[PDB]
Structure formats: C-alpha cells, structure tokens
Design an enzyme around this catalytic site. Structure first.
Site, mmCIF file in Angstrom:
data_model
loop_
_atom_site.group_PDB
_atom_site.id
_atom_site.type_symbol
_atom_site.label_atom_id
_atom_site.label_comp_id
_atom_site.label_asym_id
_atom_site.label_seq_id
_atom_site.Cartn_x
_atom_site.Cartn_y
_atom_site.Cartn_z
ATOM 1 N N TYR A 1 -0.621 6.563 3.168
ATOM 2 C CA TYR A 1 0.107 6.574 4.329
ATOM 3 C C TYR A 1 1.070 6.261 4.104
ATOM 4 O O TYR A 1 1.826 7.100 3.934
ATOM 5 C CB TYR A 1 -0.745 4.832 3.597
ATOM 6 C CG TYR A 1 -1.937 4.687 4.480
ATOM 7 C CD1 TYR A 1 -2.819 5.405 6.121
ATOM 8 C CD2 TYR A 1 -3.523 4.918 3.326
ATOM 9 C CE1 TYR A 1 -3.984 5.133 5.938
ATOM 10 C CE2 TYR A 1 -4.873 4.909 3.645
ATOM 11 C CZ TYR A 1 -4.614 5.293 4.724
ATOM 12 O OH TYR A 1 -6.811 5.230 4.588
ATOM 13 N N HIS B 1 -2.369 6.912 -1.022
ATOM 14 C CA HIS B 1 -3.484 6.997 -0.358
ATOM 15 C C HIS B 1 -3.265 8.117 1.124
ATOM 16 O O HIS B 1 -4.128 8.273 2.239
ATOM 17 C CB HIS B 1 -4.973 6.567 -0.130
ATOM 18 C CG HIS B 1 -5.702 5.609 -1.225
ATOM 19 N ND1 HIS B 1 -6.325 4.740 -0.668
ATOM 20 C CD2 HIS B 1 -5.589 6.311 -2.490
ATOM 21 C CE1 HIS B 1 -6.835 4.725 -2.168
ATOM 22 N NE2 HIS B 1 -6.117 5.166 -3.436
ATOM 23 N N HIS C 1 0.874 -1.470 0.016
ATOM 24 C CA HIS C 1 0.269 0.127 0.106
ATOM 25 C C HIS C 1 0.581 1.717 0.296
ATOM 26 O O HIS C 1 1.178 1.861 1.062
ATOM 27 C CB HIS C 1 -0.657 -0.022 1.316
ATOM 28 C CG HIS C 1 -2.201 0.936 1.021
ATOM 29 N ND1 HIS C 1 -1.782 1.638 -0.100
ATOM 30 C CD2 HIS C 1 -3.133 1.028 2.215
ATOM 31 C CE1 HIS C 1 -2.473 2.935 0.364
ATOM 32 N NE2 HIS C 1 -3.870 2.431 1.184
HETATM 33 C C1 LIG Z 1 -14.835 1.934 1.781
HETATM 34 C C2 LIG Z 1 -14.195 2.128 1.094
HETATM 35 C C3 LIG Z 1 -12.551 1.489 1.733
HETATM 36 C C4 LIG Z 1 -11.292 1.477 0.909
HETATM 37 N N1 LIG Z 1 -10.426 1.022 1.434
HETATM 38 C C5 LIG Z 1 -9.015 0.701 0.472
HETATM 39 C C6 LIG Z 1 -8.206 0.025 1.275
HETATM 40 O O1 LIG Z 1 -8.242 -0.340 2.520
HETATM 41 N N2 LIG Z 1 -6.910 -0.259 0.639
HETATM 42 C C7 LIG Z 1 -7.362 0.657 -0.822
HETATM 43 O O2 LIG Z 1 -6.380 0.556 -1.286
HETATM 44 N N3 LIG Z 1 -8.043 1.308 -1.367
HETATM 45 C C8 LIG Z 1 -9.038 1.647 -0.481
HETATM 46 N N4 LIG Z 1 -10.711 1.998 -1.313
HETATM 47 C C9 LIG Z 1 -9.976 2.756 -2.107
HETATM 48 C C10 LIG Z 1 -11.196 1.539 -2.938
HETATM 49 O O3 LIG Z 1 -9.970 0.360 -3.395
HETATM 50 C C11 LIG Z 1 -11.255 1.697 -4.661
HETATM 51 O O4 LIG Z 1 -9.674 2.416 -5.242
HETATM 52 C C12 LIG Z 1 -11.740 3.187 -4.380
HETATM 53 O O5 LIG Z 1 -13.408 2.842 -4.109
HETATM 54 C C13 LIG Z 1 -12.712 3.777 -6.096
HETATM 55 O O6 LIG Z 1 -12.888 2.869 -6.939
HETATM 56 P P1 LIG Z 1 -14.743 2.662 -7.542
HETATM 57 O O7 LIG Z 1 -15.315 3.861 -7.690
HETATM 58 O O8 LIG Z 1 -15.016 1.670 -8.077
HETATM 59 O O9 LIG Z 1 -15.294 2.483 -5.582
HETATM 60 C C14 LIG Z 1 -11.823 1.745 -0.462
HETATM 61 C C15 LIG Z 1 -12.882 2.539 -0.804
HETATM 62 C C16 LIG Z 1 -13.538 2.726 -0.118
HETATM 63 C C17 LIG Z 1 -15.093 3.324 -0.726
#
Ligand SMILES: Cc1cc2nc3c(=O)[nH]c(=O)nc-3n(C[C@H](O)[C@H](O)[C@H](O)COP(=O)(O)O)c2cc1C
Length: 362
Positions: free
Chosen positions: A184, A182, A179
C-alpha cells in the site's frame, strides 16, 4: 505458557498476547464507506482478544482502493465507528484502528472524480483489487496505472494521516496502527521496486523512509507516541512489491528510526498466504535489540510457535487473522486446547452476516 499473561502496549494493557490481526471484510455501506452495526456485532463478539486491530480503514476518500472498505474521514464515518468502539468497550475489549492509503492498489472508478489513483511513481501494481458489481457483490478487477504524487502534494498526505488520527481518537479507538505493509502507499514509497523518484522521497533508504517517518512524527504529535503502532512487511514480496536488494539492512534502518519515537508497537507481517522463507532468528535478534516497544508477529502462526518465540524473548504477542475470522472466542479455545471452527473462505470478502457473525463460540 505466556500467551495468557498481560502485556503493556503503550497506553493500553492487554490481558493476553492473542491479538486479532487486521482483516479486510468489505461489508461497509456505499455511498459513504460507512461502518455498520453488523460490523459492530462482529467486533463485539471478538472482544476477549488481547487487542483487536480493525480492518484497514481509509484516511481520506483518495485513500480508497477497495469497494466496501470503511473510512475514517467523514462525520458519518466517525459517528458509526463511535458506536462500534463503544460496543467493544462495553464488553471490556480494546480496539485499534488500522489506517491506510491504498495508493496504486486501487481503481479509477472508486477514486474522487474517477481519476487515476496516486503513488510514489507512475508504475502499475500489476495486480487486482476488489470492486462491487451492480448487485453489490465483491468482484476482482485489474489495478489502474497510478499518477506519481507531486512533491508539493506530500504535506497533504501527511496531514490526511494526522487528521484521520484526530478522528480515530474522537471515535474511541484505543490505538492506531499505520498500514506500512503489503504494497500500500507507505510501502510503495519504502520499496525501490515501486519508488523510482529522484527527489527527497526516493533513492536512498533515508529518502524512501522519509514519508513514513513524517507520518509517524505527525501522528505522535497529534495524539501521543504511546498510542501509535505500525505494521510493516519488510522481508520478502507482498502483492508484487518486493523490499529491494538490501531488504534486511533497510528494514533495520527503519526500525532504529521508529525506536527513536518511542511508539507503542512494531507489527511484523512475516509472509503472505502463499508462504515463504521464515524470518531467521539472527534477523529477529537484530530487530529486538533495536526496538524497545512491543513486537507483534503474524503470518500463519500457531499458538506453539508464538509461545516459542515469546519464550526466546524475540516477540511479545501474536496476531491471528483467519483463525479470528472463524473463532470469536479464539482466546478461550487456545487456552483450553479446543478445536477451531471450520473456516469458510467464500465469505471472507463482501456479503452480509453469513460467514461473518455466525461462527459460534464454544
Ligand atoms: C481476508 C483477509 C483480509 C486481510 N486484510 C488485511 C488488512 O486489512 N490489513 C492487513 O494489514 N492485513 C490484512 N490481512 C492479513 C492478515 O492481517 C494476516 O496477517 C494474515 O491473514 C496471515 O495470518 P493468518 O495465517 O493468521 O491468517 C488480511 C488477510 C485475509 C485472509
């Protein structure tokens, strides 16, 4: 259509290009940050994905920033994940674990000893993280100002990623995703906004990328390069972390370095939920000519956009987040052009089976 054709992802062969993005759900047991059989059911329901990428998982107790996020550092966590991956494999699926250190996106109350979390520099993230209240429910709380890591603490962070990869291999994961996105810890070092160090881990882009490249090299040596992926969000702003004033050039430096290691994949998170400017096709082509593994795109994709960019030879696969929360059989739905289940955002973070394992297949 190419979305339903196979793809070689390092050591694994995915039967389709429709991947489950890493999605934090905050349903692990405390004390111990332990995955559960409920989580196992959720992943097993989604085993038709070309690849499942798990929720972000701690490399160590210090890595923790969110109450309810699982770890992969203790014997009990290894044992619980072993059951989960066995269940995915019994349904003929493939699963990667996303490994993180949250750095400054954390709170002292969930750190070892109740101490301040660590980062590249002593700068508050100025955002929130998710704790649990006295009844176990998710709540949002302002982040604690971090302590800057000492130079002599850096090898230990590298070792923690290495150790977590040894644990992940034992736990039965098919791949590991670092990771590096974002805001981190790895991203905190990459970004000039969050990294004001004046030693070999800050300043120049070479120095800012030094930690993530040491981690990549350590984990490739522990397992194999064809088992390692990395998630980046190197263009735009994510959780208050921008990518500095030379974001494109700095991203292309990192990507050329990653390519030298022959890693399985590069996963680009292109925008957060609020959206922003799309990647230019010129930038996508500069990435493509520098990296010769799989490229995964994510961020409010549609199947049509994924097909378009796969047909242009710019990406190889798409990861869907929210559509995978709500559609365990997303692959079949996209193949058949069926409607998608209505999402219930109130149950994304925390809680139990409701809004987790109760979304139906077709
Ligand atoms: C509830 C939630 C939790 C997420 N947790 C992570 C995570 O653990 N790791 C990460 O890299 N991105 C995380 N994301 C981002 C998602 O992996 C993804 O890139 C993002 O939801 C945008 O794509 P979508 O429009 O398909 O939802 C999270 C997104 C949401 C909505």
């Amino acid at each position: 259509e190419k979305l339903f054709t196979p793809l070689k992802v390092g050591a694994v062969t995915a039967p389709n290009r429709v991947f489950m993005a890493p999605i934090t759900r905050l349903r692990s047991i405390e004390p111990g940050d332990i995955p559960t059989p409920l989580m196992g059911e959720y992943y097993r329901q989604r085993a038709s994905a070309g690849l499942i990428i798990s929720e972000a998982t701690q490399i160590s107790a210090q890595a923790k920033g969110y109450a309810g996020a699982p770890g992969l550092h203790s014997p009990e966590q290894i044992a619980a994940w072993k059951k989960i991956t066995a269940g995915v494999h019994a349904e003929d699926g493939r699963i990667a674990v996303q490994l993180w250190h949250t750095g400054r996106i954390s709170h002292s109350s969930i750190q070892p000893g109740g101490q301040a979390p660590v980062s590249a520099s002593a700068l508050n993230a100025n955002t929130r993280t998710s704790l649990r209240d006295e009844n176990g429910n998710a709540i949002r709380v302002d982040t604690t100002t971090p302590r800057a890591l000492e130079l002599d603490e850096i090898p230990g962070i590298v070792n923690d990623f290495r150790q977590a990869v040894a644990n992940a291999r034992e736990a039965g994961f098919d791949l590991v995703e670092l990771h590096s996105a974002h805001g981190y810890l790895l991203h905190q070092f990459l970004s000039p906004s969050s990294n004001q160090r004046t030693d070999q881990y800050g300043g120049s882009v070479e120095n800012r990328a030094r930690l993530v490249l040491e981690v990549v090299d350590a984990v490739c040596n522990e397992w194999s390069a064809d088992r390692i992926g990395i998630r980046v969000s190197p263009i735009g702003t994510f959780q208050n972390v921008d990518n500095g004033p030379n974001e494109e050039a700095d991203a292309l430096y990192l990507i050329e370095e990653l390519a030298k290691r022959g890693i399985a994949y590069l996963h680009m998170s292109e925008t957060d939920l609020a959206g922003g400017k799309p990647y230019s096709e010129a930038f996508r082509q500069k990435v493509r000519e520098r990296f010769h593994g799989v490229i995964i795109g994510a961020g409010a994709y549609t199947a049509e956009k994924a097909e378009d960019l796969i047909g242009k030879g710019l990406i190889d696969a798409v990861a869907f987040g929210r559509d995978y929360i709500a559609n365990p059989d997303l692959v079949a739905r996209l193949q058949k052009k069926a409607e998608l289940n209505p999402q219930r955002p109130e149950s994304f973070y925390g809680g139990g089976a409701e809004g987790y394992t109760d979304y139906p297949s077709l």
